[PDB]
Design a protein around this nucleic acid. Structure first.
Length: 101
RNA sequence: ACUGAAACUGUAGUAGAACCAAUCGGGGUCGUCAAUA
């Protein structure tokens, strides 16, 4: 068998930049994260850590509740995350481009 | 004198912390000008 899933939830919507955003990539702070197409994107690793980071502050660092959602490589009962966070291409609106602060 | 079979290199990890695009500056005011014959 696979991992036993009772219900799979597809959880979708539009995240809007309420301030500007910078997610950095390898290649001073003028390199923004780009996917393989060279489009600016949010890496799912960076979005997951934002979401996981918030829940960690919410749950007073109750590690068990966090690892029950986000997974754990160490605990023999846990392993893979039950949240999947996909990569998301950023749609910069028309007549706009990356700015430099 | 007879091919082993079957097995996801995966699992967890926010490219980030810090840094004022800033410092100085009255939109002001008076003596000529020209070189020959």
């Amino acid at each position: 068998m696979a991992r036993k899933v009772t219900t799979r939830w597809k959880i979708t919507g539009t995240l809007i930049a309420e301030t500007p955003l910078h997610i950095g990539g390898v290649g001073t702070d003028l390199a923004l994260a780009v996917n393989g197409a060279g489009e600016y994107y949010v890496p799912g690793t960076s979005l997951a850590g934002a979401l996981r980071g918030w829940m960690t502050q919410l749950l007073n660092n109750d590690e068990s509740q966090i690892k029950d959602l986000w997974g754990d490589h160490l605990d023999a009962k846990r392993g893979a995350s039950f949240v999947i966070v996909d990569d998301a291409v950023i749609h910069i609106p028309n007549n706009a481009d990356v700015e430099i602060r």
